[PDB]
UniProtKB/Swiss-Prot annotation, chain A:
Protein name listed in UniProt: T-complex protein 1 subunit theta
Organism encoding this protein: Saccharomyces cerevisiae (strain ATCC 204508 / S288c)
GO CC, any one term: chaperonin-containing T-complex
Compartments, as annotated in UniProt: Cytoplasm
Superkingdom classification of source: Eukaryota
Self-association and partners: Heterooligomeric complex of about 850 to 900 kDa that forms two stacked rings, 12 to 16 nm in diameter.
Function (record text): Molecular chaperone; assists the folding of proteins upon ATP hydrolysis. Known to play a role, in vitro, in the folding of actin and tubulin. In yeast may play a role in mitotic spindle formation.
Modification sites for Phosphoserine: S497
GO BP of this protein: chaperone mediated protein folding independent of cofactor; protein folding
Entry GO MF terms: ATP binding; ATP hydrolysis activity; ATP-dependent protein folding chaperone; unfolded protein binding
UniProtKB/Swiss-Prot annotation, chain B:
Gene Ontology MF term list: ATP binding; ATP hydrolysis activity; ATP-dependent protein folding chaperone; unfolded protein binding
Keyword field: Acetylation, ATP-binding, Chaperone, Cytoplasm, Nucleotide-binding, Phosphoprotein
Protein name: T-complex protein 1 subunit zeta
Pfam families in UniProt: Cpn60_TCP1 (PF00118)
PANTHER family, per database record: CHAPERONIN (PTHR11353)
Modified residues (N-acetylserine): S1
Length: 541, 538, 548
């Protein structure tokens, strides 16, 4: 009676494998385990949300409130959390907006199922309850859209899309950060009377170059690109040359050599005297044809030899390394030229135009300014950030990346429209799901009623992070929808929130319709997986 | 007497090794029995690297989890061989082996020698093969009806995912064959369909494509993404030389030869490109909406990309080895190695060619073919395991619909075949015996062991298997005297019987035939092994 | 595949518990485990047997060829071997003879059983084969007995009993060792012929005193007991003869002390002055009554005070110290005295008679001589044993005890019942059991015929230890038993036996002239214990051990 039988299955599989199965654990137990990381995202939600410091094993600190970024750098042993982590990764890659909503909504769907499983409801009927409730949710989101807009052009129309997204992240800045993104979108879009057929837009058209020091209000918008390099050979001519042709060369500037390793073979000394002037006049012939075409700037991705840099300095031709290939195609879109691996001679059709180039220090380090005025740019821009700390500017870049991601999600489909924010949409979905359960009798009514309860976390998080009681302002919000003016009721964050009613159209806080549709589908499937896994199999280490 | 040979040698003789074969098979079955049926459990495989894999198939479970017990290794290798040829039956064989041992182990404690027990297995198995011919129903596949293929393909998908994703994937796995058929030649190959792993839309939003889809995108921006009329030119030669076989170098006397020796390597590149450009304009010149596309298995010189960019030619490099055979079937072209011989007859044809940008990669889509001899299936998922879970569901669904064309006979499922063998193996009369009382012992153990399949299905649904099978025997008794042939199945919804033909549940011929024969040999050798020995030099 | 299941559900018992069953050749390993210690006692059998050295954990070395003594100091592991170990110890206690026979016979029954088990004979049928053959064996021993001891004591007849028993233990010289033991036996016999009294004998009566130095030829027989003691007051040769009157006191000689809180109480100086002279008059008054009775020697059982030893030297009374109990108990049997606890005058009827008490140097120390004389015979005589090494003195002491135990076999049964020696007893039983195996139909004849084969070890062991070929000598001995019995009576062929060295080729004619015989009472229990020892091993199908 001292020692246990150890079970016969101990010899089966290995000792490193761990098993969690129905009645063996899990079953709202493991659901209580993710509540530690769920509470982490609850404090980071909204404009009052709290950022979180994460120190990776490498030592780099990333301070942001984005759930997709935080869960990426964290090493988590619990496997079912990765189901929620990978669910938030899709939100950032595809749509790029609503990563905090997916983690919070999927976490509450498992919390409301705690009462369902405790009542004896099998996980088979739970999956069918959320699937039928998710289809009814997506169908009711179209009738609630008052923000349908056919413009997607004027800068003031972006105040209902880009600005509400910026309101959540770095709430301390509103008109400063919104002007940087709105002006960058106006530059990358082509100027035309009517542009149809869904003009192409990508996240690579707007870039962020972070410079230490300076106030955020001092930031501006540059149509070109700002890279940190060392100019060589001469000072720029400013506007004396006006528009100058820029030739971007993929291959470096040097006498063309074979891929195989060669060497100089000299039989007699007669070729030794001509060997010095031979390499000088050989490369000079290709460099002379470039100056005849009026090319004031040459960009060679690879390293340029000193023999090629010698000739280009006297003619006043700029040389720029651009070691990275990814940023090489970005300068080509500014001037609108074609990258040429061959040397040859520049053709007029394949050369671009740049208004002016200057070298200045924004934060004390010399950078080259590609800004082009009056010129024609296609899908290129940049945003220069000025901040005292590096970690604060990290989330600002992600806030800009999330701002331009909404433009990509707005432009690519037919449209993203608008939805009332600040807890206005989540409360309206509660009355729709609640009444939907009473229409069809059956055992699924338990899963339908609990499906609408999980929607109460979003509007109260704004009140919880504002230092308000969720037992007063939130219950009074449902009475405001009694009955248009009843769909615009929302959560108020202010010292004036005692009334708990503020018109959303005043501040114009709106959310994308396509973002909420993609966030619910991922959050519902993520919570469905946790309930659909009966047995867990682990491994050693 | 083994320790006298080696000090570190250990063994277990007679019942010492017999308890191992019964326990290890029962322990392995107890884990995999919960995965049998549409209501079965879902296992999550997590290794030391953090990879998550959700599958209900025993082939992936036994492969990722190393088995320490030597007894269960035979079951794992038997279930692995079952998945190779038939693509199905991994869980079925595991449940049969452990049951054949437990049923036979009860007679061993009664004084029955294992030799005569193995006799009752072979005699009863041969009688089951004769009943398999009468129980199976031949079908006519010349009509190529959709309704018959949808119900058979759905039965395999119900054992993988829920009914929501099943209804989406059911026409996909039904369309997995389509235009691929031969009346006379009988050759049917499922390796022509391509399994694509990408994260786009939702796992339930996937669709079937009637033409080949490639993962390589356009290398140059000026290459048109959408082409209305494209002639696919198969080129297996590498335009960019990786190395020269014979070691050689360039020795120049003067600097004027440096650009000339560099231009010497430009002649061999342009020599292969000269015949390619002449092939495009050979058909018709100055013809809009008609493009030209090249798919290369090897690498393509980035320097040569601008040569095709001026002519608006799409190029693809680093194609898979299995992609070359699929280009002849889909596009209707012919595989070519070099450019020395070209012609419009060997060029393929495609009605629609377009490319989409998903994430940081671009995928090539080819469709709208006249008589395509091959197709593909795009598997999309919302996560990492969604690609592995759906792939294991499709690959197990491919072999199911293939046996329908390979064998016109279809056997009803839902445990109707296992229950029918119970009443047939009770009394063999004087037909096949071979001994008095010796053979009948092994037959009774094999007959009652075939009932574990219908009982396991009910246990996963949360009902009583004894009450479900009780009404099954009552229906079979009245059906024999009523001059009516009825196939009684097992319904897991209301806990009652059903008809597999009406409910739409069927099983493959090769899966059930190899499961009975495969599980018989594994269980027989374990009953014939009285000693487990381990010896060797460390 | 990498690691075995390692016998699942083995946690039912502690890891130190092991299970061994007759299956898987463990019953063969048990028989093979017997052969490890069996060959140890084979070379020790017979007069040519070889003694063995065994060193214990304390460093004591006992050199003996006796199987019962050697197995005492050895640490036994295998359980069934302890069955054979404890079987030889019982034979030494009970009959004091035939110890090496039980060790060898019980070991050979398992050796022939290995072939019996291999043929498929069950453990039940093997036990029944030995039990039926042993009952026939005990009946044939009474039919083959020849001669008898008749009278209890004789000079010649005691050479046909003790001498062949002590020939195997420290052979050496024959007549030297036989005369020393045969002399001490005649003294402890009550004789008293024609009176019809029941004879009596004690195996602990004869005591062997080990004294280093000298030679075996210098040994003698002492009618009295010999101890190493130093007289306190004086030494006396007692040449004044007229014998002596001796008294024995198991209690010490001293003033009687209260068992609780003995204390000197003196109230005044008047009682203190007479306290010193008071204790002197107490011993004087008590010892005067003993000296008036003519008691020249007093045997004490504990420490005697100095005040009591003073008056004993005044009258010239010897003082003897007899520690413990058994040493003092055998002293009164010599002189025929009855101890009494009190210090008063002993009863004249309880006084013993010892003619002379001498103290001389034998092994370098003073020993007291209790030796008796022709008249006034005494009992429990001792034998002085002189030797160069102490190791030889230990086994010869046990060799004499083997001859003393042989005298006990002349009391309980009706007579001595001499059997043919030199292995002729076990050889004749081979031809009788062989005929008995054929007379019994059925499958039980396999164990009966092999039961007589186990008796072939006695002639083979005596021939192998003698430096002779067992292949030439043994078949030549069956020629006397292969001719059965002629048409005339008086057949002396039953006296043929195995000879040691010499001219070999059988020899020693008929053993009747050699005078070496065996005891029937010894062979009865030697076969029964050896059979049950091998039967117990064969009757155990499963053996379980602990901690190892």
């Amino acid at each position: 009676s001292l020692r246990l039988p150890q079970n016969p299955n101990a010899g089966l599989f290995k000792q490193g494998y761990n098993s969690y199965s129905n009645a063996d654990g899990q079953i709202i137990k493991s659901i209580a385990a993710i509540r530690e990381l769920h509470q982490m995202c609850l404090t980071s939600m909204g404009p009052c949300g709290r950022n979180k410091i994460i120190v990776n094993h490498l030592g780099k600190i990333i301070i942001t409130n984005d759930a997709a970024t935080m869960l990426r750098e964290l090493d988590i042993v619990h496997p079912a959390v990765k189901v929620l982590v990978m669910a938030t990764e899709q939100q950032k890659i595809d749509m790029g907006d609503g990563t905090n909503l997916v983690m919070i909504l999927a976490g509450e769907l498992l919390n409301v199922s705690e009462k369902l499983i405790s009542m004896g409801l099998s996980a088979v009927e739970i999956i069918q309850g959320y699937n039928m409730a998710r289809k009814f949710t997506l169908k009711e989101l179209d009738e609630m859209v008052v923000g349908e807009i056919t413009d997607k052009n004027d800068k003031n129309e972006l105040l209902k899309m880009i600005k509400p997204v910026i309101s959540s992240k770095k709430y301390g800045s509103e008109d400063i950060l919104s002007e940087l993104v709105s002006e960058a979108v106006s530059h990358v879009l082509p100027v035309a009377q009517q542009a149809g057929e869904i003009p192409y837009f990508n996240v690579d058209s707007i870039r962020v170059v972070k410079i230490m020091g300076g106030s955020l209000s001092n930031s501006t918008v540059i149509k070109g690109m700002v890279f940190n390099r060392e100019p060589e050979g001469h000072v720029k001519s400013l506007s004396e040359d006006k528009k100058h042709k820029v030739a971007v060369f993929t291959c470096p500037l040097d006498i063309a050599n074979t891929e195989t390793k060669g060497t100089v073979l000299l039989h007699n000394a007669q070729e030794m005297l001509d060997f010095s002037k031979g390499e000088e006049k050989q490369i000079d012939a290709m460099m002379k044809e470039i100056a005849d075409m009026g090319v004031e700037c040459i960009v060679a991705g690879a390293g340029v030899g000193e023999l090629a840099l010698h000739y280009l300095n006297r003619y006043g031709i700029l040389v720029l390394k651009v070691p990275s290939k990814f940023e090489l195609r970005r300068l080509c879109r500014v001037c609108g030229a074609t990258p040429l691996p061959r040397l040859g001679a520049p053709t007029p059709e394949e050369l671009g135009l740049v208004e002016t180039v200057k070298t200045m220090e924004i934060g004390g380090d010399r950078v080259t300014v590609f800004k082009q005025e009056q010129g024609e740019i296609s899908r290129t821009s940049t945003i220069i950030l000025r901040g005292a700390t590096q970690n604060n500017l990290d989330d600002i870049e992600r806030a800009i990346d999330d701002g331009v991601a909404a433009v990509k999600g707005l432009m690519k489909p037919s449209g993203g429209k608008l939805l009332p924010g600040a807890g206005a949409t989540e409360i309206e979905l509660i009355s729709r799901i609640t009444k939907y359960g009473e229409r069809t009798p059956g055992l699924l009514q338990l899963a339908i009623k609990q499906f609408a309860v999980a929607f109460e976390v979003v509007p109260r998080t704004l009140a919880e992070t504002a230092g308000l009681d969720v037992n007063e302002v939130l219950p009074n919000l449902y009475a405001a929808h009694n009955v248009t003016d009843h769909l615009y009721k929302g959560v108020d964050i202010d010292g004036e929130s005692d009334e708990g009613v503020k018109d959303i159209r005043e501040e114009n806080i709106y959310d994308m319709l396509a973002t909420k549709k993609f966030a619910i589908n991922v959050a519902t499937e993520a919570a469905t997986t946790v309930l659909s896994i009966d047995q867990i199999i682990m491994a050693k280490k | 007497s083994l320790q006298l040979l080696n000090p570190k040698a250990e063994s277990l003789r007679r019942d010492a090794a017999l308890k191992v074969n019964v326990t290890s098979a029962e322990g392995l079955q107890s884990v995999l029995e919960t995965n049998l049926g549409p209501k079965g459990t879902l296992k999550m495989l997590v290794d030391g690297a953090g990879n998550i894999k959700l599958t209900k198939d025993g082939k992936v479970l036994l492969t990722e989890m190393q088995i320490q017990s030597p007894t269960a290794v035979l079951i794992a290798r038997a279930a692995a061989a079952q998945d190779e040829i038939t693509g199905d039956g991994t869980t079925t064989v595991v449940c049969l082996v452990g049951e054949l041992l437990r049923q036979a182990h009860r007679f061993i404690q009664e004084g029955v020698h294992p030799r005569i027990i193995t006799d009752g297995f072979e005699i009863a198995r041969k009688e089951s093969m004769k009943f398999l011919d009468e129980f199976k129903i031949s079908k006519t596949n010349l009509s190529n009806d959709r309704e018959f293929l949808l119900q058979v393909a759905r039965s395999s998908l119900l054992t993988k995912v829920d009914a929501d994703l099943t209804e989406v994937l059911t026409p996909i796995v039904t369309d997995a064959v389509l235009s691929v058929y031969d009346a006379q030649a009988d050759n049917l190959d499922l390796h022509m369909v391509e399994i694509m792993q990408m994260q786009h839309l939702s796992p339930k939003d996937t669709t079937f494509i009637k033409g080949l889809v490639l993962d390589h995108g356009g290398r140059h921006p000026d290459m048109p993404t959408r082409v209305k009329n494209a002639y696919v030119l198969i080129l297996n030669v590498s335009l960019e030389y990786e190395k020269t076989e014979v070691n050689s170098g360039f020795f120049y006397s003067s600097a004027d030869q440096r650009d000339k020796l560099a231009a010497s390597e430009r002649k061999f590149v342009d020599a292969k490109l000269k015949k390619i450009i002449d092939l495009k304009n050979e058909v018709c010149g100055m013809d809009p909406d008609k493009g030209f596309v090249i798919i290369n298995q090897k690498g393509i010189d980035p320097m040569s990309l601008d040569v095709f960019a001026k002519h608006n030619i799409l190029a693809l490099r680093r194609a898979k080895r299995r992609n070359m055979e699929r280009l002849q079937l889909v596009t209707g072209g012919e595989a070519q190695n070099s450019v020395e011989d070209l012609s419009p007859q060997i060029l393929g044809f495609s009605g629609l060619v377009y490319q989409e940008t998903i994430g940081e990669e671009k995928f090539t889509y080819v469709t709208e073919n006249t008589d395509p001899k091959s197709c593909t299936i795009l598997i999309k998922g919302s996560t990492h395991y969604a690609l592995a879970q759906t792939k294991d569901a499709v690959r197990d669904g491919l072999r199911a619909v293939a046996n329908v064309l390979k064998d016109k006979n279809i056997i009803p499922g839902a445990g109707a075949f296992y229950i029918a063998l119970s009443r047939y193996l009770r009394s063999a009369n004087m037909n096949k015996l071979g001994a008095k009382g010796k053979t009948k012992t092994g037959i009774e153990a094999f007959a009652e062991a075939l009932l574990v399949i219908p009982k396991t299905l009910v246990k996963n649904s949360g009902f009583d298997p004894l009450d479900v099978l009780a009404m099954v025997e009552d229906e079979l008794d009245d059906a024999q005297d009523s001059d009516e042939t009825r196939y009684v199945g097992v319904d897991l919804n209301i806990g009652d019987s059903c008809d597999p033909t009406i409910e739409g549940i069927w099983d493959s011929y090769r899966v059930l035939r190899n499961a009975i024969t495969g599980a018989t040999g594994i269980a027989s050798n374990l009953l014939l092994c009285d000693e487990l020995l381990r010896a060797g030099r460390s």
